[PDB]
Design a protein around this nucleic acid. Structure first.
Ligand code: MG
Ligand code: MG
Ligand code: MG
Ligand code: MG
Ligand code: MG
Ligand code: MG
Ligand code: MG
Ligand code: MG
Ligand code: MG
Ligand code: MG
Ligand code: MG
Ligand code: MG
Ligand code: MG
Ligand code: MG
Ligand code: MG
Ligand code: MG
Ligand code: MG
Ligand code: MG
Ligand code: MG
Ligand code: MG
Ligand code: MG
Ligand code: MG
Ligand code: MG
Ligand code: MG
Ligand code: MG
Ligand code: MG
Ligand code: MG
Ligand code: MG
Ligand code: MG
Ligand code: MG
Ligand code: MG
Ligand code: MG
Ligand code: MG
Ligand code: MG
Ligand code: MG
Ligand code: MG
Ligand code: MG
Ligand code: MG
Ligand code: MG
Ligand code: MG
Lengths: 145, 93, 190
RNA sequence: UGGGGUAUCGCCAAGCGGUAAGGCACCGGAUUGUGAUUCCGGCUUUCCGAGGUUCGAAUCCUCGUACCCCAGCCA
RNA sequence: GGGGGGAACCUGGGGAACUGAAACAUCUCAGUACCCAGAGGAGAGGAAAGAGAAAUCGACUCCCUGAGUAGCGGCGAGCGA
RNA sequence: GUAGGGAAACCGAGUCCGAACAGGGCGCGUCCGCGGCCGUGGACCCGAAACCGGGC
RNA sequence: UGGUGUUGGCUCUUGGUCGCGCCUGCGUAGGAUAGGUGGGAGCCUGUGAACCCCCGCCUCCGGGUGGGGGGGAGGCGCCGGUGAAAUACCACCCUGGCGCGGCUGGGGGCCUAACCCUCGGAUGGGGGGACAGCGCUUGGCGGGCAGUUUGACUGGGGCGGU
RNA sequence: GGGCCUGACUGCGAGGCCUGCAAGCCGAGCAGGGGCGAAAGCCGGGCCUAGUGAACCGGUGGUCCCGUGUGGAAGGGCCAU
């Protein structure tokens, strides 16, 4: 008997997948124990829902990333730092960079998964990254004056 | 007794007592030693089923058993309640 | 596959190793089977045919060039048969069961020849190109096949050994065959 | 009515494609008060019998015969 | 809205035996008597997943004929489109 | 009812069995009324011992 | 009482079938353990071989196969000979065999969640547990009940005889 | 007692014995294909009267036959047993 699973199962399964088992198992173990559900016509075209109501939701995050990687994986910025030769006195914690972008160019930053590690503090140019899936390794110049 | 879904119930029937060799084989014909009435039952069974918040069971034949677990479905979009298992089952078509 | 893909004949000493091996209804009840004498083979593939014209020592003059090469007589009977190191065939017609030289003393001696007034004719053939292979209690079939050099013109046993389907006295299914020896063995219907 | 099983030395009976194995039966011989049980040796061979298979077949296929079982009907 | 009742008629759910066969078990009597239920002035059934051989017909119901035909049958008694 | 033989297909005063063109086997009303007898039905009239159903 | 339904998980466990893969077959002569039959005069080694050692299984105690290491360019058939059958190696297929495999089966353990028993009233906890129970189906034991049969003649009826 | 044979026939049957019915029985001859005899002829089992069983139900051979729309089947019928 065809039935749609939920919380996966050793022996057979994985949310969504559809394997079939003897009426018994079904009706007396899976269906009452909320394990899996009937594979009706009903909840059939319905699994289509979450199969695409997530497949096309995930494609959004993937599509707001790669769509800010061809418009922001190529920008390098220029930082208004102050010091003199070697070290500064103001590293540049993420946010800083962001206030030098969210407002210096116009880009809301998520000041953490940006690839910046221990605060900078020294003149020169750098590269970082971002995002969880296809990222966006964006450089950045630390200046003077 | 009589299934509650399909409505099956005991039918009556005779049991034939033949003897002899069918003429489809050896031949000579085939005789009948004894008849007599008796009844065939519907293989009904019990089917307890959660639903709403109660239990409610069923006098259904293994034949229309699926149909039971099939109602519990089409009623998920219903307002079945009140301490009425007796009424739950009722409106459960 | 497709038909008789001779191509499978694709590797050593001149390709004349391909066979026709099959299998069928084991010697049922009383009767059985036995291929025919000198199955022509619509190719011929000039093989070393030894039509030993057991004639009266005269059909060695036109039996040497009409469908063979060398020939003997009633001398391989009791002069070259006395010793087992000097001795096919075609028995004397009429009333002469030549069962005094070839019978038992385990080879060829089943079908004879035709041309009492000369060991040939005015269109000499049907005596030099093939042979047979009777019924081996267990594994029957096993027939002679052709050689590499021809396309839709090499499969000469697909028509020959094939239609030889003229022994079916009363048995079962005669399938399970293929072709080739000193090589491999493919799979093609019939 | 189908389909099995056999019948081989004298009694019952082992039983592979290359060969006839045993006990018992009787006979000779040793021992025996006497007497079973002993202990050796044999004793007996168209293996039902007619075809074909095979280089040959008791031992394997067809066929015919006798009897043994199973199962099965009986106007 | 029901429950209860109504001469006979109706339909559905169950359902004998004497008897017949010149005894008796298939068979017959009989789906009758009779138990129960439902309906109504009637009930039933009714618009083809049909009939059956006609290049056909064209709900159902009921009467006459079809015909004691076809067939059924310890092919008996006898049952019957 | 004017057609009958034949298991039948089938032919026809014929026909069936038959190798036969021997034989032989089978080959010409209805509708009412009245009466006798017969069939199915309780079938001249009373009479069992009993069997079955549902009730008391 | 078999089968099937209500009946579900898990592991072990053997069959029977077909696939395929590797072995398998020791009369007397023959280099010996030769399965039939067909092709066949040339193949196998760097697509790393003869003696050797380790190691598994078969045994007709001689003989057989696969895996690995050493090693390094040889082997084996036509031949011949013998025998009814000859030969490498390439097939197709018999007798029995195992090995993974499809499809089916037979049993054995253990589980809970059907079902059943039950527990100061329980959406539960305990116990049995895939068995029992009940439906359909199969064959049987069955005067406990049920329908009926148990002939005629006949110096009365039975008994005897016909 | 011996030699050749198989009439221990197929088609049929005028005419009668018997006789409640059904059965039982005898039969000359004609046609077909035969046997023995030279021929006339004879032969459709047995010197002779006992050696047996209606129908129903089936089975095996045959065969012209029927064949559920038509073709073919299944299943029937007829002859034989
Ligand atoms: Mg009957
Ligand atoms: Mg079902
Ligand atoms: Mg003394
Ligand atoms: Mg017996
Ligand atoms: Mg009312
Ligand atoms: Mg009322
Ligand atoms: Mg009724
Ligand atoms: Mg009665
Ligand atoms: Mg009576
Ligand atoms: Mg009636
Ligand atoms: Mg009736
Ligand atoms: Mg009216
Ligand atoms: Mg009305
Ligand atoms: Mg209506
Ligand atoms: Mg019809
Ligand atoms: Mg019209
Ligand atoms: Mg209409
Ligand atoms: Mg009768
Ligand atoms: Mg009736
Ligand atoms: Mg030796
Ligand atoms: Mg020798
Ligand atoms: Mg347990
Ligand atoms: Mg439990
Ligand atoms: Mg409980
Ligand atoms: Mg059970
Ligand atoms: Mg009694
Ligand atoms: Mg009665
Ligand atoms: Mg009575
Ligand atoms: Mg009397
Ligand atoms: Mg008496
Ligand atoms: Mg005489
Ligand atoms: Mg008379
Ligand atoms: Mg006469
Ligand atoms: Mg004469
Ligand atoms: Mg004469
Ligand atoms: Mg006489
Ligand atoms: Mg009849
Ligand atoms: Mg018949
Ligand atoms: Mg029809
Ligand atoms: Mg038809």
């Amino acid at each position: 008997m065809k039935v749609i699973l939920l919380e996966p199962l050793e022996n057979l399964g994985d949310v969504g997948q559809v394997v079939d088992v003897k009426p018994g198992y079904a009706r007396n173990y899976l269906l009452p124990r909320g394990l899996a559900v009937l594979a009706t016509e009903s909840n059939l075209k319905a699994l289509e829902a979450r199969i695409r109501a997530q497949a096309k939701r995930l494609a959004e995050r993937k599509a707001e990333a790669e769509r800010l990687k061809e418009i922001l994986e190529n920008l390098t910025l220029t930082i208004p730092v102050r010091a003199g030769e070697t070290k500064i006195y103001g590293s540049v914690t993420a946010k800083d960079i962001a206030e030098a972008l969210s407002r210096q160019h116009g880009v809301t930053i998520d000041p953490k998964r940006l690839a910046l590690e221990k605060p900078i503090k020294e003149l020169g140019e750098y590269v970082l990254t971002y995002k969880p899936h296809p990222e966006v390794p964006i450089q950045l110049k630390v200046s003077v004056v | 007794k009589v299934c509650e879904i399909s409505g099956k119930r005991p039918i009556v029937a005779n049991s034939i007592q033949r003897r002899g060799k069918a003429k489809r084989e050896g031949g000579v014909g085939k005789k009948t030693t004894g008849i007599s009435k008796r009844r065939q039952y519907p293989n009904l069974q019990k089917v307890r089923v959660r639903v709403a918040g109660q239990e409610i069971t069923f006098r259904v034949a293994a034949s229309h058993i699926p149909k039971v677990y099939e109602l519990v479905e089409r009623a998920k979009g219903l307002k079945l309640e009140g301490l009425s298992p007796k009424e739950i089952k009722k409106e459960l078509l | 596959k497709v038909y008789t893909i001779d191509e499978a004949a694709r590797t050593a000493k001149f390709d004349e190793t391909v066979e026709v091996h099959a299998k069928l209804g084991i010697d049922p009840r009383r009767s059985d089977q036995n291929v025919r004498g000198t199955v022509s083979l619509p190719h011929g593939l000039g093989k070393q045919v030894r039509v030993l014209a057991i004639a009266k020592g005269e059909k060695i003059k036109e039996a040497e060039e009409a469908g063979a090469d060398y020939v003997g007589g009633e001398e391989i009977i009791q002069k070259i048969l006395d010793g087992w190191m000097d001795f096919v065939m075609g028995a004397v017609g009429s009333k002469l069961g030549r069962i005094l030289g070839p019978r038992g003393l385990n080879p060829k001696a089943g079908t004879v020849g035709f041309n009492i007034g000369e060991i040939i004719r005015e269109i000499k053939a049907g005596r030099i190109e093939f042979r047979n292979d009777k019924t081996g209690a267990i594994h029957a079939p096993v027939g002679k096949a052709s050689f590499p050099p021809e396309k839709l013109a090499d499969n000469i046993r697909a028509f020959i050994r094939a239609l030889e389907a003229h022994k079916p006295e009363g048995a079962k299914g005669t399938f399970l065959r293929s072709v080739y020896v000193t090589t491999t063995m493919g799979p093609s219907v019939r």
